[PDB]
Write a protein that binds this ligand. Sequence first.
Ligand SMILES: O=C(Cn1cc(CNS(=O)(=O)c2ccc(I)cc2)nn1)N1CCC(c2nc(-c3cccs3)no2)CC1
Ligand SMILES: O=C(Cn1cc(CNS(=O)(=O)c2ccc(I)cc2)nn1)N1CCC(c2nc(-c3cccs3)no2)CC1
Lengths: 194, 194
Amino acid sequence: GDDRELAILATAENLLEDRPLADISVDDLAKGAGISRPTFYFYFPSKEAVLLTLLDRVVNQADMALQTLAENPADTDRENMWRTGINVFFETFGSHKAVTRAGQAARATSVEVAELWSTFMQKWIAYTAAVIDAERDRGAAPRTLPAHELATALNLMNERTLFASFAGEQPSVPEARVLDTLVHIWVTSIYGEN
Amino acid sequence: GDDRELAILATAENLLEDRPLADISVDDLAKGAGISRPTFYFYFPSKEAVLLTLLDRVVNQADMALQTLAENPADTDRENMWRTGINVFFETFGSHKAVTRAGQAARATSVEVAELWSTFMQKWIAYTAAVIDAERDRGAAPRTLPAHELATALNLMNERTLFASFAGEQPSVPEARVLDTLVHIWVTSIYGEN
Ligand SMILES: O=C(Cn1cc(CNS(=O)(=O)c2ccc(I)cc2)nn1)N1CCC(c2nc(-c3cccs3)no2)CC1
Ligand SMILES: O=C(Cn1cc(CNS(=O)(=O)c2ccc(I)cc2)nn1)N1CCC(c2nc(-c3cccs3)no2)CC1
């Protein structure tokens, strides 16, 4: 029963490796899950709804991993703090490229997908800004840009730059260079007096 | 004759202020241009092709304005140099929000639109990297990240962050704050030793 829902999700993730959601039919999904098409419709109203659930799982896995980090002491220098935090997103979405690619595309045609992404981006921006505020309050970071606006730009850079790297877009930073690139820009802009 | 092509382009830009390309018919475009539908088809094979031409015009206007700056002496401090350069993009695309918004959407469904955008992004990244290289060669900027990878991330941040601001996305930096935000991040990451 839940095996059937999970089988549908796994099929969808597999199939998305090789083709876009448009090129995947409910029949394909039902076939791979070892169920009929009307049984599929018991579990999901559409193939679009299966993508939403896949993306919700990955997004929540990233969010939970960040929350785990936030709850640690984790004694290391400031650069290494930002790196471990950005690395949560690099590894989580990097482990789920087909879902990442499919989810990004579906922001344009799905209000629930756009809303899911927006809700989590606002959360991650708020956490970034709160950590910046703490760094300022302890005297480690200078009071330059408004912390929330800084957080916003840096998070949007990550969104676009991680994605370009994972998709192999032209232009893109090689995936093997993107962590180091993002961390440099976060650290110099957060701690830089100029 | 060219008046007719330009009339079609102007109509399309006007209509895109209020609705997406999907919600605009060839009939609407022909109507606004004061021509018949088959006359329209003489000028453009599709409404999609009209968008491509609009975007090509804006993109080339940004590119030409940047080339003009590059060809100036323009005696000012380094922060102000980057600001005037980023400001080319802020003003050009900011003056053409409907075309910007429509073009961004069409990257997903149009290979010519994706290719146009990619070609210019590669150009602007290469120019950014060349200016960074010059700053390093004169001893003004430190030899930190590979200049082309740095340029790439900073340009992608601008692409996504300018666009979020112009679209009024949640999350976004207010349009009245985005220039200052981008310039801070470019200047600290280019000149920052850490
Ligand atoms: O990268 C992000 C947020 N983010 C995540 C993404 C995902 N990019 S992506 O994979 O290409 C993607 C794009 C679109 C879609 I739909 C799905 C995925 N873009 N931005 N961060 C970096 C680290 C920030 C942070 N770290 C920390 C700490 C580090 C160490 C201790 S606390 N505090 O805040 C939180 C948000
Ligand atoms: O911002 C960019 C490139 N860019 C432009 C954009 C457009 N963003 S946008 O408007 O939201 C948009 C997004 C998507 C689409 I389709 C159309 C528009 N994104 N990135 N720059 C900043 C300045 C860089 C530069 N300045 C300079 C100099 C400054 C002063 C002397 S030389 N040299 O390189 C060149 C590229």
